[PDB]
Amino acid sequence: GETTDGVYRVMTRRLLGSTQVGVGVMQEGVFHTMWHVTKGAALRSGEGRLDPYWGDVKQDLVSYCGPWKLDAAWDGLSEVQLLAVPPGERAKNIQTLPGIFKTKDGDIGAVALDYPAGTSGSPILDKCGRVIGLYGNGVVIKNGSYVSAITQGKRE
């Protein structure tokens, strides 16, 4: 299968035609996505198979072929880029300054950009192109607009 670093679409043929169920990151031979995109199902890359390796429904993350590899963090100050990959549209960088999710267990960076559900797993990055975490698990605000968390995992 294709194991070149980059951003990938996550597709199904189980519904009408081919449907983008979301996105993920291929890094060091590991595929990284949000748990709500695949629900822990195996994935096809050509005639190669990607087995789940690590997942956590609460963090809403899953890794394929290996442990989570993405360890960069938002610096709490600088603007970031959503590399948005929307269903049937060309990958696009969108620059924003993260908001903050205040929780009992502390502060998470957050992004206020709305894309379709099938944009879920689009990688947020820093000025050196490091993946600081993924788009697609967040909140609907008083407006009705979408605010997404910078969901990052742990590297061991």
Binding site: G1, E2, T4, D5, G6, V7, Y8, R9, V10, M11, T12, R13, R14, V21, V23, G24, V25, M26, F31, H36, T38, A41, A42, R44, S45, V57, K58, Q59, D60, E79, Q81, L83, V85, A91, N93, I94, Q95, T96, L97, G99, F101, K102, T103, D105, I108, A110, V111, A112, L113, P123, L125, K127, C128, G129, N137, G138, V139, I141, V147, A149
Partner: protein, 39 residues
């Protein structure tokens, strides 16, 4: 059955469309991984 298709390289791109506000929200995270607004 799910399959992946490459969509691009991962890279910072100078003069991306610059947009979105930066709200400070009080949130709760449930055991099912659903964020919710505290008020």
């Amino acid at each position: 059955d799910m399959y992946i298709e490459r969509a691009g390289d991962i890279t910072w791109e100078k003069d991306a469309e610059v947009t979105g506000n930066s709200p400070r929200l009080d949130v709760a995270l449930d055991e099912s991984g659903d964020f919710s607004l505290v008020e």
